[PDB]
Write a protein that binds this ligand. Structure first.
Ligand code: CLA
Ligand code: CLA
Ligand code: CLA
Ligand SMILES: CC1=C(C#C/C(C)=C/C=C/C(C)=C/C=C/C=C(C)/C=C/C=C(C)/C=C/[C@@]23O[C@]2(C)C[C@@H](O)CC3(C)C)C(C)(C)C[C@H](O)C1
Lengths: 49, 56
């Protein structure tokens, strides 16, 4: 960011925040499904995923 | 009157049914009878304490 302009810095922060939020939700869902608790898939496939 | 009610009884026996014929399954219990697993109500992550056998 040393040579970037303000718009580029704001876009970098937007990318960072989108990735961070997606990653937080991803970890939540990953642990949720790794604990079992995967009902949508269970019901859709008729079997325990 | 005896003949009248004899004819009435004949007509009753011919045209009337004891029961509507509803499926017996709707009368059988589901919970507490030991046959819970048949209905697959709690299949995802089933409760271990409930016996797996469906014999009742
Ligand atoms: C990065 C996020 C992310 C991604 C990519 C996925 C992807 C997937 N999940 Mg999900 N999941 C997530 C988060 C995520 N999950 C979270 C946070 C939870 C709750 C802890 C779950 C709980 C969950 C279960 C219980 C199951 C899945 C399953 C699945 C698969 C099928 C889709 C489905 O219906 O699940 C989605 C189900 C949900 C309950 C998702 C809830 C999402 C919350 C409410 C966040 C909403 C954010 C919102 C849109 C933000 C606003 C933005 C807007 C203003 C622009 C798929 C691979 C299935 C699977 O793989 O089974 C083997 C399955 O059974 N997920
Ligand atoms: C579908 C989801 C998605 C989308 C639309 C984007 C979009 C973007 N990512 Mg990527 N990214 C994703 C998932 C996603 N990412 C995931 C899951 C990871 C974790 C491995 C990353 C890790 C990541 C890093 C470390 C960086 C980006 C960057 C970028 C930007 C430049 C494109 C690039 O270099 O991609 C190609 C590179 C990748 C890692 C993406 C492929 C990942 C696969 C699917 C796993 C762009 C906004 C770069 C950026 O502009 O940062 C300022 C950057 O530095 N992403
Ligand atoms: C973002 C939304 C969200 C959140 C936070 C949770 C959270 C939970 N769900 Mg899930 N769930 C969701 C959406 C969500 N659910 C959706 C939309 C569905 C589809 C209907 C389900 C379907 C579902 C079922 C069928 C079950 C759960 C259960 C659970 C527990 C999972 C335990 C675990 O290992 O989590 C991993 C770790 C974490 C999620 C971190 C902890 C976060 C909290 C806030 C503390 C927990 C209370 C289980 C339970 O006990 O339910 C009573 C269970 O059996 N969920
Ligand atoms: C009736 C029936 C069935 C059914 C059904 C139904 C109705 C199922 C419903 C499922 C449902 C309701 C599933 C929701 C998923 C939501 C997800 C994954 C959201 C992700 C959200 C994400 C990844 C968000 C990301 C971002 O927001 C972040 C973090 C920041 C923003 O800047 C940018 C974006 C927007 C990218 C069975 C049970 C399947 C089988 C049975 O036989 C018959």
């Amino acid at each position: 960011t040393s040579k970037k302009s303000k718009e580029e810095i704001l876009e970098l922060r937007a990318i960072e925040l989108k990735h961070g939020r997606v990653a937080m939700l991803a970890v939540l869902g990953w642990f949720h499904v790794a604990a079992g608790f995967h009902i949508i898939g269970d019901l859709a496939t008729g079997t325990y995923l | 009157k005896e003949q009248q009610f004899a004819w009435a009884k004949a007509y009753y026996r011919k045209y009337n049914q004891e029961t509507d014929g509803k499926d017996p399954k709707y009368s059988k219990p589901s919970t507490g009878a030991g046959v819970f697993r048949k209905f697959k109500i709690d299949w995802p992550n089933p409760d271990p304490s409930i016996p797996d056998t469906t014999d009742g």
